[PDB]
Amino acid sequence: TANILKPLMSPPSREEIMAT
Amino acid sequence: LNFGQVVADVLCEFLEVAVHLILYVREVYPVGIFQKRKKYNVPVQMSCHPELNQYIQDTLHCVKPLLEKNDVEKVVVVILDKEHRPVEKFVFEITQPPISSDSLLSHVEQLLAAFILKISVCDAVLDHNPPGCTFTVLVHTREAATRNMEKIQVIKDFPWILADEQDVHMHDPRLIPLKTMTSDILKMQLYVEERAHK
Amino acid sequence: APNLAGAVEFNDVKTLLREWITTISDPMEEDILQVVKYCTDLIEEKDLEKLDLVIKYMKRLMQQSVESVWNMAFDFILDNVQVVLQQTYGSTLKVT
User: Which run of H or of E encompasses C69?
Assistant: First the structure.
């Protein structure tokens, strides 16, 4: 609803992490 | 009622540590990215991964100015399952108390460390999450007010939208209180909502 | 699946907006925010034709209004649509 805000971006996934 | 800059700073530092801990104890990310650290005289696990760290840093940096003016009812760390249905929620419900209480600022570490300790052992009372879970953070404003968006919208690279029902609705939730604290100027409560079959 | 307050069909959104900006001189913020949301849902649903139409429509009515308030309302909605486009598409909407 009209009083919930959320980031457009997803956090980096598990996959995207497996290699850094 | 309004908080201040520093109270808001305190709360954001607190929430950064907390979010990290949650992602650790609930294996949202594998243990290999974490490193033991010490906040509030107690043991925590902080991610080392720069992209993830920046995400969590960005998120909270944006919430800060709304905490400043006490415009946030809840910050919620939502854990989503492989099909993007919410499985679990960590809710930090933040109230202003209306004087014989503890000073928040004198007692910061004792007062917040209690939350951290509870997060550390919380898997003892939660059901295991399925594999593939991701996370999202959600901010519940006290008011539906234009200014929350102006104030939140401070990093071009890191914009915010209004959430829908999809992002929120959990089927058959069960509630697990973790910790409640009252102070000088702040009442905070941390509790988890999990799905009844996960 | 993208609706303003139930209005799904483009023209229901048009009339609803028109009546709204043409009747009210102090709009509820809660409503303004729904407009923003409606627009960002248009972006997530890949309906860039419609938001361009909506944007332009409410630009024309909002800015034509005598009220300082609608002028500021438009600016808010567009700002919040632009940061989202700039990240979903690498671009901001062209507004002349």
Answer: helix C68-88
